[PDB]
Structure 1
Amino acid sequence: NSQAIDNLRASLETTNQAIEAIRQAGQEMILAVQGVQDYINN
């Protein structure tokens, strides 16, 4: 029914948003490892 389709779409859009937040966490973790490498080399 239209509520079931709306809820599946809304859940999947929310899930996609959650995955983007995890992707951003990954970028920050990479910056942290780069900062460890810079500290060792410097």
Structure 2
Amino acid sequence: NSQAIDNLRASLETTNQAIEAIRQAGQEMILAVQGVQDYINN
């Protein structure tokens, strides 16, 4: 039980690090699409 609990916590804190990367990638993609709307707008 105790090993698997320590396993799960290790896994999940890595998973959170992955999500944090996908989340920063999202913010960058938004700036890129805004890049395109800025050339159209101007």
TM-score interval for Structure 1 and Structure 2 normalised by the shorter chain? 0.7 to 0.9
SS at structure 2 position matched to 1:24: helix
Q: Offset of 1:3 from its aligned partner?
A: 2.1
Could you tell me the TM-score, scaled by structure 2's length? 0.87
Aligned-residue RMSD, C-alpha = 0.9
Q: Which runs of 5+ in 1 are unaligned?
A: none
Distance 2:21 2:35 in 1: 21
Runs of 4+ displaced beyond 2 Å: none
Q: Offset of 1:5 from its aligned partner?
A: 1.3
Equivalent pairs: percent with the same residue? 100
Q: Which runs of 5+ in 2 are unaligned?
A: none
Could you tell me the TM-score, scaled by structure 1's length? 0.87
